[PDB]
């Protein structure tokens, strides 16, 4: 009802308050991450942790989101935070395009170089992110409006196993489809097959996201046991953007 | 409400037609039945307008990657609401029991949830058929000609779109129906992975996977 | 006496323990760093802070360093930590060389892109670091042995205003000159004027370092008031490398 | 112990020779005396073998940047240990008092410390002269031909090196003596900055800096 691309677009502009640290990602005791690299790895976790918090705060102020049952608000963020980081990395990484791409932007004034990815053994995923997501989005020439819409759609996933009110999550995702479709036919008008072209990035985002967890779990970086808990507190205690 | 071009209608007809003709100790069963259907899938795929325009190694790239995902669709497609389970002409292979007698029972819940979720969408055999095509022509890693495949895929994509638009009088809900269908492409990916993970498990638990699957779903 | 290039070279290999966080750098209350950039800026401070700690631990185990008066051990690290970060950034940045250089490596698997520097208004300093230090060191073809020696020389600065035992700091820096000179004439042998060519980077490192403080202080990122204190505790409490 | 080539000895002689011929309300004084010496420095520089080989704008680049640094050397060079202060033929300009009557008294301690530190090195007029040259030919930002300047500088660098080696019989301590001298190049940089900072201060406190300095030490 109030959920719209125009609204999501202005939220995108708000800034998360001094990220009340939550250990979603961290290098812990007995890790297979060689000694000389924990410091770096750990600082990258530090960063993601910050992004996740900003993400948890974004989801909260999303029209009707907080009107959802708390159990669901949790499960939803819980199931999509990873894909949302990657999607954001890929959006942010487009500026550094143009041999395959060599720079991935994890945050403003911060980029991962392909070679670091190679040494890390994460070469493929690094490349999939930059071509399947970043390059394709540049080619597809996807704008911010479509970018926010897709975020909302990724978030509001009613297929999330465990929700107590699937219908409520559906009405919200469907309103998003309605919104995205309207945007495309009233602006991108000429471009046929666009609605599907955009939405076709989602399963791409999903495969990459899954491969990510393969690695994060392999190197014991995720605190799966505590994610839900962190989201629960973040939603309630964190401070609202600016 | 732009009607379906005689070309798209022939395409729908063609697919709905061939789909029917491709319907259908413990672990021993499953592995075999899967092979049968995996063959029905490969045949349905090869007879798909556009499969030929594509390179030979790219066909293997698609058939290999879409095999488990489309397998998930097949099973899901035979979910009975009344008995809340999969009535796959019950070779007693895709049932909670056999999957238990076969060990891999944990996987059942994740599968059923998808069944429940897909069932609720209320898809036509047309919706379902176009989707199977669209799945097969998705951008998979390692395609020598991604641009081409994307070409082929877009033809099915647009057919599905027009079919829905006509079926709903250009109703706004069209994007909703069309949208949820493309949404399955995403959930289908996680299931495929889970399939892969199981294979990797049999590997470090040394289980017998008939060379057919051993090849189609890799081993390295 | 025990201070030698061979020894410094093996220390270089040891790894600082889970960096007991010390706020040398941080974005604090009322900062002129625009909102949408505090998160990033703050994570970069987070990183430097980690490097500084590793630096404080390096200085400690340096032959005879801890045999110095505590007041001096503090003043020395206090006066050279900034130049040592920059020198390390420049050493690390050589791998990304070859339009001017575009990548600065603040840490393994982490690089700053010139454009981020431009937007940050720190374009020149970013360029001086990459040419006056990084490029020149590649050209000069300076190896690790010379790299460690120079670090030691930068650290052991007897001119540091405030020391209570200048002589003790001198004997140590002079032993370093002796060491560096011996290394050059017994290895780089052919290369004449090398000893001075190496040492000529130091005043370059100094100017750049000073320009850095110009910026850090401008954006209220330094906690000058608390540096000494942090070093004092770090020396005593921190844990030894691996 | 490779002796000084007749070419280097003539160079030392030349420099030591010209250095002697260039020896030497409150704020009003300073600013003027500085100008005089800054002129002596510019003249010493121009008569330096190699200054000509360099571009015209690069000369201005060097003279502008080395001016304050070499100024620091000049003052420091006249530090009296007994009275622990600067006996610059005391125009009562570079004394704690005038610098106080001129406001900028805080700066005194930092200056003296350098004086104390430089004094302790015990430099020859040769050490000191070669150093002044070496300072002037240092790599400064904005040089059209850094490679060239570096050329010129290396000639003085090597002279200083050989002079020290001979003065010490190829003693190991040579690297120590040579090393500490190049160390001054670094401390000299911080002083130069501090000089710049003061200029910036007069700017936002609107003080009178004779156009001579206003230009040589910028204003923008
Ligand atoms: C010795 C250093 C070792 C480790 C690093 C220490 C942490 C301090 C941060 C230094 C990194 C700065 C560059 C990266 C910035 C990325 C953020 C960005 O793009 O900001 C734009 C924003 C537009 O604003 P907007 O337009 O208002 O305001 C623009 C005003 N310029 O800009 C800002 O918000 C300004 C941020 C100021 C950062 C301080 C620079 C400190 C320089 C230290 C020297 C080291 C070399 C440089 C590192 C790249
Ligand atoms: C969803 C992500 C959002 C934000 C980021 C979350 C923080 C997790 C860290 C991810 C960045 C990894 C790449 C950068 C590494 C830099 C360190 C490096 O060069 O290590 C070499 C070392 C040689 O070891 P050595 O030889 O033993 O062992 C080598 C074994 N490969 O390698 C290691 O120590 C391995 C470190 C493992 C990092 C986990 C990768 C997680 C991938 C997430 C997917 C996102 C795209 C990739 C980001 C670039
Ligand atoms: C020979 C074989 N045949 C199948 C299969 C059987 C029915 C539908 C789809 C597939 Cl892929 N599987 N897959 C599963 O048994 C299976 C089924 C459903 C799932 C699942 C797996 C691994 O993973 C989680 C989601 O649902 C296997 C191996 C992997 C044992
Ligand atoms: C006209 C003028 N002449 C000088 C000067 C006077 C004597 C030696 C060197 C210099 Cl650069 N200064 N410099 C200083 O007074 C000065 C002297 C010593 C310092 C210092 C400054 C700014 O900064 C801190 C280190 O020692 C000025 C301006 C800047 C007032």
Tab-separated table of C-alpha atoms in Angstrom, chain C residues 2-237:
chain	number	residue	atom	x	y	z
C	2	UNK	CA	72.477	-8.743	18.634
C	3	UNK	CA	70.726	-6.163	16.440
C	4	UNK	CA	71.198	-7.312	12.859
C	5	UNK	CA	69.493	-7.436	9.493
C	6	UNK	CA	69.345	-11.227	9.697
C	7	UNK	CA	67.457	-11.029	13.004
C	8	UNK	CA	65.074	-8.240	11.932
C	9	UNK	CA	64.365	-10.348	8.853
C	10	UNK	CA	63.039	-13.252	10.881
C	11	UNK	CA	61.038	-11.011	13.202
C	12	UNK	CA	59.293	-9.649	10.091
C	13	UNK	CA	57.891	-13.168	9.740
C	14	UNK	CA	56.354	-13.437	13.224
C	15	UNK	CA	52.609	-12.672	13.511
C	16	UNK	CA	50.951	-10.299	15.978
C	17	UNK	CA	48.379	-11.961	18.239
C	18	UNK	CA	44.628	-11.069	17.826
C	19	UNK	CA	45.396	-7.333	17.938
C	20	UNK	CA	44.158	-6.135	21.346
C	21	UNK	CA	42.301	-3.101	19.954
C	22	UNK	CA	43.660	0.386	20.761
C	23	UNK	CA	41.887	3.498	19.425
C	24	UNK	CA	44.841	5.391	17.911
C	25	UNK	CA	42.641	6.277	14.949
C	26	UNK	CA	38.852	6.599	14.944
C	27	UNK	CA	36.033	8.731	13.631
C	28	UNK	CA	34.672	10.453	16.691
C	29	UNK	CA	31.873	12.801	17.794
C	30	UNK	CA	31.158	15.784	15.549
C	31	UNK	CA	33.372	14.939	12.589
C	32	UNK	CA	33.547	16.770	9.286
C	33	UNK	CA	33.541	13.394	7.550
C	34	UNK	CA	30.192	13.347	5.701
C	35	UNK	CA	27.691	10.803	7.174
C	36	UNK	CA	27.590	8.366	4.251
C	37	UNK	CA	31.332	7.870	4.635
C	38	UNK	CA	31.931	7.404	8.340
C	39	UNK	CA	31.322	3.666	8.147
C	40	UNK	CA	34.086	3.187	5.528
C	41	UNK	CA	36.455	5.730	7.094
C	42	UNK	CA	35.940	4.091	10.447
C	43	UNK	CA	36.768	0.633	9.108
C	44	UNK	CA	39.963	1.973	7.623
C	45	UNK	CA	40.812	3.408	11.060
C	46	UNK	CA	39.965	-0.015	12.446
C	47	UNK	CA	42.578	-1.436	10.101
C	48	UNK	CA	45.339	1.050	10.839
C	49	UNK	CA	44.704	0.523	14.531
C	50	UNK	CA	45.374	-3.140	13.955
C	51	UNK	CA	48.602	-2.413	12.053
C	52	UNK	CA	49.803	-0.006	14.751
C	53	UNK	CA	49.367	-2.687	17.399
C	54	UNK	CA	51.346	-5.137	15.295
C	55	UNK	CA	53.927	-2.390	14.985
C	56	UNK	CA	54.085	-1.787	18.706
C	57	UNK	CA	54.700	-5.479	19.180
C	58	UNK	CA	57.400	-5.508	16.508
C	59	UNK	CA	59.314	-2.644	18.106
C	60	UNK	CA	59.189	-4.396	21.478
C	61	UNK	CA	61.027	-7.565	20.406
C	62	UNK	CA	63.645	-5.560	18.516
C	63	UNK	CA	67.100	-6.391	19.952
C	64	UNK	CA	67.897	-4.067	22.865
C	65	UNK	CA	64.802	-1.954	22.198
C	66	UNK	CA	63.073	-3.069	25.391
C	67	UNK	CA	66.371	-2.593	27.223
C	68	UNK	CA	65.722	1.113	26.628
C	69	UNK	CA	64.000	3.277	29.218
C	70	UNK	CA	60.219	2.922	29.015
C	71	UNK	CA	59.759	6.682	28.501
C	72	UNK	CA	61.904	6.398	25.360
C	73	UNK	CA	60.357	3.155	24.043
C	74	UNK	CA	57.115	5.149	24.067
C	75	UNK	CA	58.369	8.404	22.498
C	76	UNK	CA	60.080	6.433	19.722
C	77	UNK	CA	57.034	4.433	18.641
C	78	UNK	CA	54.955	7.526	19.211
C	79	UNK	CA	57.069	9.493	16.752
C	80	UNK	CA	57.433	6.883	14.018
C	81	UNK	CA	54.216	4.794	13.855
C	82	UNK	CA	52.747	6.943	11.087
C	83	UNK	CA	55.841	6.844	8.866
C	84	UNK	CA	56.040	3.077	9.436
C	85	UNK	CA	52.456	2.496	8.296
C	86	UNK	CA	53.010	4.521	5.140
C	87	UNK	CA	56.351	2.810	4.469
C	88	UNK	CA	54.571	-0.531	4.862
C	89	UNK	CA	51.744	0.614	2.635
C	90	UNK	CA	54.280	1.567	-0.010
C	91	UNK	CA	56.204	-1.711	0.302
C	92	UNK	CA	52.979	-3.680	0.043
C	93	UNK	CA	51.767	-1.483	-2.850
C	94	UNK	CA	54.645	-2.368	-5.189
C	95	UNK	CA	52.904	-5.606	-6.233
C	96	UNK	CA	50.077	-3.555	-7.801
C	97	UNK	CA	52.255	-1.361	-10.054
C	98	UNK	CA	51.914	-0.834	-13.841
C	99	UNK	CA	48.588	6.736	-16.457
C	100	UNK	CA	49.860	6.829	-12.836
C	101	UNK	CA	49.576	3.836	-10.498
C	102	UNK	CA	45.952	3.288	-9.538
C	103	UNK	CA	46.100	0.849	-6.624
C	104	UNK	CA	47.347	1.328	-3.062
C	105	UNK	CA	47.449	-1.737	-0.812
C	106	UNK	CA	46.519	-0.900	2.800
C	107	UNK	CA	46.604	-4.586	3.740
C	108	UNK	CA	46.691	-8.064	2.154
C	109	UNK	CA	43.572	-8.474	0.043
C	110	UNK	CA	42.642	-4.857	0.417
C	111	UNK	CA	43.457	-1.944	-1.840
C	112	UNK	CA	42.525	1.695	-2.064
C	113	UNK	CA	41.730	2.922	-5.565
C	114	UNK	CA	43.078	6.273	-6.704
C	115	UNK	CA	39.551	7.428	-7.473
C	116	UNK	CA	38.505	6.884	-3.882
C	117	UNK	CA	41.555	8.952	-2.939
C	118	UNK	CA	40.469	11.665	-5.397
C	119	UNK	CA	36.955	11.868	-3.980
C	120	UNK	CA	38.524	11.891	-0.516
C	121	UNK	CA	40.515	14.948	-1.553
C	122	UNK	CA	43.729	13.060	-0.780
C	123	UNK	CA	44.836	12.603	-4.389
C	124	UNK	CA	48.341	14.084	-4.153
C	125	UNK	CA	49.465	12.237	-1.043
C	126	UNK	CA	48.135	9.024	-2.602
C	127	UNK	CA	50.275	9.725	-5.666
C	128	UNK	CA	53.389	10.757	-3.772
C	129	UNK	CA	53.225	7.511	-1.794
C	130	UNK	CA	53.039	5.400	-4.956
C	131	UNK	CA	55.841	7.169	-6.894
C	132	UNK	CA	58.237	8.643	-4.298
C	133	UNK	CA	58.080	5.431	-2.305
C	134	UNK	CA	56.573	2.463	-4.146
C	135	UNK	CA	57.735	3.091	-7.690
C	136	UNK	CA	61.157	4.377	-6.588
C	137	UNK	CA	61.686	1.308	-4.421
C	138	UNK	CA	60.810	-0.992	-7.314
C	139	UNK	CA	63.172	0.927	-9.596
C	140	UNK	CA	65.832	0.979	-6.911
C	141	UNK	CA	65.003	-2.709	-6.651
C	142	UNK	CA	65.141	-2.624	-2.833
C	143	UNK	CA	64.890	-6.049	-1.214
C	144	UNK	CA	63.411	-7.210	2.091
C	145	UNK	CA	66.771	-7.034	3.898
C	146	UNK	CA	67.052	-3.350	3.080
C	147	UNK	CA	63.355	-2.956	3.848
C	148	UNK	CA	63.693	-4.223	7.434
C	149	UNK	CA	66.912	-2.282	8.012
C	150	UNK	CA	65.192	0.960	7.006
C	151	UNK	CA	62.250	0.217	9.318
C	152	UNK	CA	64.679	-0.164	12.215
C	153	UNK	CA	66.424	3.071	11.233
C	154	UNK	CA	63.121	4.943	11.022
C	155	UNK	CA	62.141	3.621	14.454
C	156	UNK	CA	65.410	4.273	16.259
C	157	UNK	CA	65.400	8.034	15.714
C	158	UNK	CA	67.614	9.661	18.363
C	159	UNK	CA	66.519	13.128	17.289
C	160	UNK	CA	63.147	12.445	18.902
C	161	UNK	CA	62.515	15.480	21.113
C	162	UNK	CA	61.919	14.387	24.703
C	163	UNK	CA	64.020	11.224	25.081
C	164	UNK	CA	65.896	10.813	28.367
C	165	UNK	CA	68.667	8.670	26.864
C	166	UNK	CA	69.640	9.911	23.421
C	167	UNK	CA	73.020	8.153	23.557
C	168	UNK	CA	71.364	4.735	23.959
C	169	UNK	CA	69.120	5.408	20.975
C	170	UNK	CA	72.154	6.576	18.974
C	171	UNK	CA	74.265	3.496	19.567
C	172	UNK	CA	71.322	1.475	18.212
C	173	UNK	CA	70.696	3.564	15.091
C	174	UNK	CA	74.412	3.695	14.314
C	175	UNK	CA	74.673	-0.074	14.600
C	176	UNK	CA	71.894	-0.107	12.045
C	177	UNK	CA	73.838	2.123	9.621
C	178	UNK	CA	76.818	-0.181	10.073
C	179	UNK	CA	74.558	-3.124	9.287
C	180	UNK	CA	72.919	-1.550	6.238
C	181	UNK	CA	76.271	-0.452	4.816
C	182	UNK	CA	77.770	-3.922	5.303
C	183	UNK	CA	74.755	-5.510	3.575
C	184	UNK	CA	75.057	-3.239	0.558
C	185	UNK	CA	78.776	-3.747	0.030
C	186	UNK	CA	78.678	-7.535	0.526
C	187	UNK	CA	75.659	-8.216	-1.703
C	188	UNK	CA	74.541	-5.264	-3.822
C	189	UNK	CA	78.337	-4.815	-4.133
C	190	UNK	CA	78.357	-3.496	-7.708
C	191	UNK	CA	75.798	-0.773	-6.968
C	192	UNK	CA	77.679	2.333	-5.886
C	193	UNK	CA	75.862	5.149	-4.120
C	194	UNK	CA	73.279	2.653	-2.914
C	195	UNK	CA	73.591	3.312	0.828
C	196	UNK	CA	72.659	6.932	0.149
C	197	UNK	CA	70.048	5.968	-2.457
C	198	UNK	CA	68.189	3.894	0.133
C	199	UNK	CA	68.491	6.426	2.948
C	200	UNK	CA	67.215	9.099	0.549
C	201	UNK	CA	63.719	7.620	0.861
C	202	UNK	CA	63.553	8.585	4.538
C	203	UNK	CA	63.073	12.303	4.105
C	204	UNK	CA	60.563	11.450	1.357
C	205	UNK	CA	58.755	9.190	3.804
C	206	UNK	CA	58.830	12.079	6.303
C	207	UNK	CA	57.261	14.726	4.095
C	208	UNK	CA	54.461	12.358	3.060
C	209	UNK	CA	53.948	11.346	6.683
C	210	UNK	CA	53.587	14.995	7.693
C	211	UNK	CA	51.045	15.647	4.932
C	212	UNK	CA	49.097	12.630	6.254
C	213	UNK	CA	48.785	14.154	9.698
C	214	UNK	CA	47.599	17.308	7.996
C	215	UNK	CA	44.580	15.319	6.771
C	216	UNK	CA	44.031	12.999	9.735
C	217	UNK	CA	43.993	15.991	12.099
C	218	UNK	CA	41.774	17.973	9.732
C	219	UNK	CA	39.153	15.199	9.873
C	220	UNK	CA	39.639	14.622	13.610
C	221	UNK	CA	40.738	11.001	13.187
C	222	UNK	CA	43.723	11.007	15.524
C	223	UNK	CA	43.499	10.596	19.277
C	224	UNK	CA	46.761	12.453	19.906
C	225	UNK	CA	45.778	12.923	23.529
C	226	UNK	CA	45.841	9.149	24.049
C	227	UNK	CA	48.591	7.764	21.777
C	228	UNK	CA	51.378	7.640	24.374
C	229	UNK	CA	49.004	5.918	26.769
C	230	UNK	CA	48.044	3.267	24.197
C	231	UNK	CA	51.671	2.517	23.446
C	232	UNK	CA	52.492	2.271	27.127
C	233	UNK	CA	49.819	-0.403	27.703
C	234	UNK	CA	50.412	-2.191	24.398
C	235	UNK	CA	54.079	-2.692	25.200
C	236	UNK	CA	53.284	-4.188	28.601
C	237	UNK	CA	50.008	-6.091	28.070
